[PDB]
Amino acid sequence: EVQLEESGPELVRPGTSVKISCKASGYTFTNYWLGWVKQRPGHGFEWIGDIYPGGVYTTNNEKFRGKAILTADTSSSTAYMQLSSLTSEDSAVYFCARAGGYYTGGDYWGQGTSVTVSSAKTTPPSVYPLAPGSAAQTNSMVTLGCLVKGYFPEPVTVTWNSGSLSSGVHTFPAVLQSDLYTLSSSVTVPSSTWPSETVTCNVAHPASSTKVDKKIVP
Amino acid sequence: DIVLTQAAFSNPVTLGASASISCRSSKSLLNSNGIIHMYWYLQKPGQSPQLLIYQMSKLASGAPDRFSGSGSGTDFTLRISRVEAEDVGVYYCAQNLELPYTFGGGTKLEIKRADAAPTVSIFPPSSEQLTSGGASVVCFLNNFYPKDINVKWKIDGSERQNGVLNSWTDQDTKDSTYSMSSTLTLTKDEYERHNSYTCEATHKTSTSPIVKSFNRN
Ligand SMILES: [Zn+2]
Ligand SMILES: [Zn+2]
């Protein structure tokens, strides 16, 4: 199985440089081109450049001249992209993809690497439980939730009961305000199962090396 | 730079029916060597893009044969014989004929399904947030269709637009509905001076807006 494993999310200050990786496996690394594309929040795709590890040839998007450079480490089957003189315009998700062959497009893609360029400090999330208040919420089904507030930077991972509870879950896109993100997540379960079968949301924020579990109590 | 023009949206499509997405290039993508440098990619919410069609009409490996592509070399069409719920997402055309390689703006495909009223749930501030001087009132409006909706917040009967943060989910890949979260963020000080808090939703499934509320006491 062809696999492209990209490095983890990055929070870096403007004016500096960051280098992200794409470890490939499952095929002859030196026989195919690897390309990189940029996707800003709410935007489409922008091609950055391609690299052929077998001789180390590169084709680049001149729009990024002096901003990006592609390299490859054949001994580790890893491709790299370094971005310099960073500004908020560089904040985005970068994907690496393999070119299936002779002009057959990107047939395999990495999971993407989120890069945030900001002067703001990393701040762990505050997780607040959302349990049925003053108004008997339904009766056949009941909706619970968690409010994740005041964290930076993106992203956070939300699961319920450590991932064992997935149906009826809605985790909403985070919204930025005053340099802090806020997100929410709801889960609808059978009324006859709660509170007998506990419900707990788990919020992981790698950036701050923090994870908090909040059990929802009546 | 080669410009690829695609509509931002497609008309809602009935599940099980055929659908088409088009893309127009500012110049022929046909090579002198006879190769058409046109590709179609699909990106589902929170996922990496997937290749569907390469060289204008060749089916990518890993892509279901429900998808097909054609074109004149300058105008292109991606077709879906039978649309499924999991097909929702954004379809992009792209070209690598000339540098810099470019992508179209993407066309979002939406599934048409039966109207569904939103299930509204309102939640007062948690004791834990209040302790820190904050007071967020949360309102979930889940599984509704169509997507068009308006939420209004009222404190003691008066509309409040300040301090409201809304977020939406993409069309669900299973039931084809939409969901929305609206949060009214106040300071504890402010929260404690008023009594009734209301979340109101205006949707085509009801003449009167769907209301949910509670009284601080
Ligand atoms: Zn739902
Ligand atoms: Zn007031």
SS3 for chain B is CCCEECCCECCCEECCCCEEEEEEECCCCECCCCCECEEEEEECCCCCCEEEEECCCEECCCCCCCEEEEECCCEEEEEECCCCHHHCEEEEEEECCCCCCEECCCEEECEECCCECCEEEEECCCHHHHHCCEEEEEEEEEEEECCCCEEEEEECCEEECCCEEEEECCCCCCCCCEEEEEEEEEEHHHHCCCCEEEEEEECCCCCCCEEEEEECC
- Give me the amino acid identity at B172: D
Kindly state whether A161 is in contact with chain B, defined as any CB-CB distance less than 8 angstroms. Answer: no
Of A47, A129, A183, the CB nearest to B102: A47
The CATH number of domain B1-113, selected from 3.50.50.60, 3.40.50.1700, 3.10.180.10, 2.60.40.10: 2.60.40.10
Contact indicator for B197, B138 with CB cutoff of 8 Å: no
Of B54, B119, B181, the CB nearest to A172: B181
- Other Cβ atoms less than 10 A from the Cβ of A163: the count is 9
Cα-to-centroid distance, A4 and ligand 1 (Å) = 32
Measured between alpha carbons, how far is residue A113 from residues A6, A37, A38, A64, B180 in Å?
6, 11, 10, 18, 27
On the question of a cis peptide bond just before residue A124, with omega within 30 degrees of 0, the verdict is no
> Between β-strands B13-14 and B111-112, what pairing exists: parallel, antiparallel or unpaired?
parallel
- Give me the amino acid identity at A129: P
B window 33-62, beta carbon within 8 A of A: 35, 37, 39, 41, 48-51, 54-55, 58, 60-62
For B189, the token pair is 């000080």
Measured between alpha carbons, how far is residue A95 from residues A22, A112, A125, B82, B183 in Å?
9, 4, 27, 30, 32
Contact indicator for B144, B210 with CB cutoff of 8 Å: no
Residues 6+ apart with CB under 8 A from A75: none
Distance CA A93, CA A193 (A): 39
Distance CA B99, CA A25 (A): 28
Domain B114-216 - what CATH class? mainly beta
Contact indicator for B69, A76 with CB cutoff of 8 Å: no
Each domain of chain A, given as residue ranges in start order, spans: 1-119, 120-218
Q: Whose atoms come closest to the Cα of B144: which ligand?
A: 1
Q: What resolution does the deposited structure have, in angstroms?
A: 1.9
Q: Would you say the CATH fold of A120-218 matches that of A1-119? A: yes
B window 158-177, beta carbon within 8 A of A: 165-169
Distance CA B29, CA B36 (A): 5
Cα torsion at A191, A215, A136, B160 (round to 10°)?
-130
Distance CA A188, CA A171 (A): 12
Q: Report the DSSP beta bridge partners of residue A73.
A: A78
Method: X-ray
- B92, B123, B211, B213, best to mutate vs chain A, most A CBs in 10 Å: B123
Distance CA A158, CA A170 (A): 10
- Other Cβ atoms less than 10 A from the Cβ of A24: the count is 23
Specify the residue for token string 């089957």.
Answer: A77
Contact indicator for B197, B211 with CB cutoff of 8 Å: no
Measured between alpha carbons, how far is residue B69 from residues A21, A80, B42, B76, B153 in Å?
33, 33, 13, 7, 47
Cα torsion at B121, B127, B128, B134 (round to 10°)?
80
Residues 6+ apart with CB under 8 A from A42: none
Measured between alpha carbons, how far is residue A131 from residues A142, B1, B131, B179, B188 in Å?
9, 53, 17, 19, 19
Distance CA B142, CA A189 (A): 13
* Share of chain A residues as helix, strand and coil, in percent rounded to the nearest 5: 10, 50, 40
Report residues near ion ligand 1: CB below 5 Å. Answer: B 143
Taking every pair of C-alpha atoms in chain A, what is the biggest distance, in angstroms? 68
Measured between alpha carbons, how far is residue B12 from residues A20, A145, B113 in Å?
39, 31, 9
Q: The domain at A120-218 falls in which architecture? A: Sandwich (2.60)
Distance CA B40, CA B42 (A): 7
Specify the residue for token string 């729009």.
Answer: A63
Q: Would you say the CATH fold of B114-216 matches that of B1-113? A: yes
Specify the residue for token string 């970068």.
Answer: A94
| Of A44, A45, A46, A35, nearest in space to A105 by CA | A35
Distance CA B180, CA B167 (A): 6
For A28, the token pair is 């002859």
Kindly state whether A135 is in contact with chain B, defined as any CB-CB distance less than 8 angstroms. Answer: yes
| Of A188, A183, A184, A213, nearest in space to A201 by CA | A213
CATH number, domain A1-119 = 2.60.40.10
Each domain of chain B, given as residue ranges in start order, spans: 1-113, 114-216
